[PDB]
Amino acid sequence: VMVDKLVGELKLESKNFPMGSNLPDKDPVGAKDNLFYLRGERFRLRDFTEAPDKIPYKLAWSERGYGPEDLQVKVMHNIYPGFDKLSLAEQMQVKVFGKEIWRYGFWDLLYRVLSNEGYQFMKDAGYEANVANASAVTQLPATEYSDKTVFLTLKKGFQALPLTLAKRF
Amino acid sequence: QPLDVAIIGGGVSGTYSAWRLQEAQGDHQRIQLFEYSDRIGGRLFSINLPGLPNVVAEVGGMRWMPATKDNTGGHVMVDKLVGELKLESKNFPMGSNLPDKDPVGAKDNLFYLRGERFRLRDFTEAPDKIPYKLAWSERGYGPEDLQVKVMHNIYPGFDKLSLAEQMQVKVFGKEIWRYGFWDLLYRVLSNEGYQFMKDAGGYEANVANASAVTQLPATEYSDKTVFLTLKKGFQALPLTLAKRFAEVPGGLIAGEQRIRMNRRLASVQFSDDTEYPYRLHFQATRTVDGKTSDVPGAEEIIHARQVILALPRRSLELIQSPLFDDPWLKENIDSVLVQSAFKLFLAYEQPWWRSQGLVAGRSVTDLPIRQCYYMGTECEQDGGEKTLNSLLMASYNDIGTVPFWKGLEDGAPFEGYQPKSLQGRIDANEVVPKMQYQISEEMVRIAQRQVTSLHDQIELPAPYSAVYHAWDADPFGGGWHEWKANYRLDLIIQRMRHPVQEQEVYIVGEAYSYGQGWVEGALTTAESTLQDFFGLPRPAWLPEAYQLLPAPAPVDIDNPPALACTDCKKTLTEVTEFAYTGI
Amino acid sequence: VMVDKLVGELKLESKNFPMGSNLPDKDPVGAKDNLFYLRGERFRLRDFTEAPDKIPYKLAWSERGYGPEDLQVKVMHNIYPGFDKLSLAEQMQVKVFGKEIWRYGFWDLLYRVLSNEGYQFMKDAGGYEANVANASAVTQLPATEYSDKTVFLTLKKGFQALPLTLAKRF
Amino acid sequence: QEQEVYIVGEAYSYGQGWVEGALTTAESTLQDFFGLPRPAWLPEAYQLLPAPAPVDIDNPPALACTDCKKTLTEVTEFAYTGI
Ligand SMILES: Cc1cc2nc3c(=O)[nH]c(=O)nc-3n(C[C@H](O)[C@H](O)[C@H](O)COP(=O)(O)OP(=O)(O)OC[C@H]3O[C@@H](n4cnc5c(N)ncnc54)[C@H](O)[C@@H]3O)c2cc1C
């Protein structure tokens, strides 16, 4: 809100920072037709669901047939249904296999609820870093990376907000 | 009364330094070694887990390459002082001696990468089972074997060149030492064959991008390579030294004041005493159960003629001194990459691995354990207990930070369980050793969980004892050091013995040796300093044959004369036969 | 012993029990060639080691290449190296997964020391069929009495001969 | 132990499912309670029925791993077969 409305008062211009194809406009293929090149095998984002045989990760039967962004949400609910819709206050009291979830690094969790071939997977296909074991209460509902969510960019470049903040100062 | 020399840091480097000196120039000068902690040996650490009193769990150093008969090759320094100080040495096995007839060695040792299980033999026996898209050319070489194919592919014989000649070898129009290690391999290997070697070979997640001139002839770690660890555990050497130091008859100072422990150097300063331009302001340091913290007390100051710093990179970085301002020493303390080291030991009443035709060596996996080593069974040891108690070593990953071996360091502590073999001999509060780090009820459970999987098992017998340790804490901030790239190790290997000439300060340690991550590296750096800058001679136990340090190439690597090749008629022939192996 | 020595003092006729084949004279198949017909796939005793592909039981990797006996022996050395190289008293004092081995029912141990597929296997391939006993494992585990090299004997006049000869003698 | 009724058979023997069971039970029952000698044909070595463990094994003394140097070799060599 702060960024959308501040750009508001500062009357700086906005563009829709595009994450997918709007072509065709009959049926945009979003990013479905966007590329993936892991374990010396090429496929697409559509292949994850449309042709899970094409994915060269020996993941379990329970994990087969989900894109990685969709698999994060499976893990979350598996852990607890609704985490995303909880308040931080509440999300801190949530516990997994005994410990509160914020006592888990983001991978000291994944390697307990996913297969190692799901663990290695998500990694290769997040920024390898991704979280380098960031608290799991922050890094688990990181399911806004989608092309389904919206994103706006400054036309004059994002650096125009702090510059325009300096000048008006 | 003031000190002529102050060998600061009680590492294998320090302990060797003070010894020879007092031995020779000790009635002639006031020599004193200064230790941070309650323990000599430094990285060399040797605990005996309860129930395994004859299965040393070397947390730090473990083995050493035996000397060759020409004595110019092998960990010559280590392997002659192990005789001189007279210390017991057993073979460090990497393979299985059984079957006596046709010893499989490490061939049968396990691999679990990308959720598929094979063995070292399945490389040269059935590559079909490697679940990596290695290109035709590369398909059929073992991790070790591959590295050598690449090496050769570069400048045939790279392993045969002296450091001097090696440095001058360019590849694709660049000095080999200008490339890192991976940066190189991601131009000679398929991106799978790259990934593949990054998942198996030598250490682990380590093999960090380091000067290719150090890390390309790093194939030594094979199952044909002989190796020995001290019976008493590697810490034995830098203690017999620490003892032997204070045990020299001819001395100005008696043995009781010679080895001053629980003394951490915080400031080296230029005094006014033109004879002791070194005001060392130490601080009191107390060690409770491996965790040494500071006693605010008073910064005790002792006057020194010279201070032989036997410290690795952080250890140094931790002293406040105008000496580190020297522009060279400012930018040549970053010549080496700090890389952390973790390690888990688990004690079992049964070596369940034997039931599965694995004896000694390691097994590799895409699981966080990444590595695992089978050590030995107490009763297999020469005049050991009559127990089937045994030791599995692991957590031998090796990475920057926030990995998965620091992600389970918290919760509740593992107490373990009194084995039948230690009933009324030791208490369940005393089974799991209290170390600097206390392995948790959680880290044990996950480790075991993972170990099970690795070995394709349903459930293994729970361990009774378990210790975790790390070298990611100051005063080390890292296990072993590896030379960075676009650096001239050849020169720095020489000039870190005396960073500043005018000033009589000498830094010794593996941290700036050719033998980085080796005890040889720390002995060599010390010895070649004693000889050049303290005029100590070659002792009787060291051959002259063994060149201590390697030939520094000229500073003029600008367009030097081309290296006149030798027996290509041989070289190229060994290079071609070596490629018939993989076909 | 008692049978081998009683049939001695009773001077009764002994003959070999061939749990296998004697041909060819040079290098006998022993059993090896003997038939199996599990899970609608036919195979032979050899095809366990020679040709594991052919075994229709999806056993784990560590479990492939043994016969049902051989497998049992692995498991037993797993439970405790040289468990068969003990006395009964010593065997009652061996603990696995916290419990004395003799508090486990056979199967109830296998499932925790073997794959289900390996479990089923051994339950679909044993000596006395339907070994089903969940019997004190301390007795039924070291049953390494079933092979093509394990020497067996019978009585020419049949095993009923032993009781009768005693009854006669009596 | 008050009565004079004795039970022999394969059922309550270490030799269950075998004859030897029947023969071993009976003999010891005779050698012990019927005062019979040991047949000159039945060798002293052969222990008929196995000996029991103490009736308290709640905290058993650790078995003396006499020879592992031998045992662990074979256990290993046994594994190398199934590779
Ligand atoms: C995990 C691991 C495995 C290894 N395995 C092997 C192996 O198998 N074979 C082999 O040959 N080598 C091995 N090595 C290498 C071996 O540990 C080194 O050769 C050796 O321990 C380093 O000696 P050093 O003198 O360079 O310093 P260290 O041994 O690190 O000694 C440094 C000393 O400085 C002291 N110190 C720190 N700060 C201060 C201060 N302010 N004042 C005073 N003292 C201070 C410390 O307390 C310590 O005693 C291994 C190393 C690691 C980390």
Ligand SMILES: Cc1cc2nc3c(=O)[nH]c(=O)nc-3n(C[C@H](O)[C@H](O)[C@H](O)COP(=O)(O)OP(=O)(O)OC[C@H]3O[C@@H](n4cnc5c(N)ncnc54)[C@H](O)[C@@H]3O)c2cc1C
């Ligand atoms: C299918 C099968 C295969 C076997 N294979 C082998 C083998 O290969 N090798 C081997 O060594 N052993 C084998 N055995 C076991 C072996 O036959 C027995 O262990 C042996 O017969 C034991 O004799 P016993 O006296 O203990 O009991 P039994 O043979 O049962 O003797 C009991 C006797 O008492 C009689 N009886 C029972 N109740 C009464 C009553 N109320 N009044 C009077 N008489 C009564 C019975 O009719 C019988 O005559 C096998 C058993 C079976 C069933």
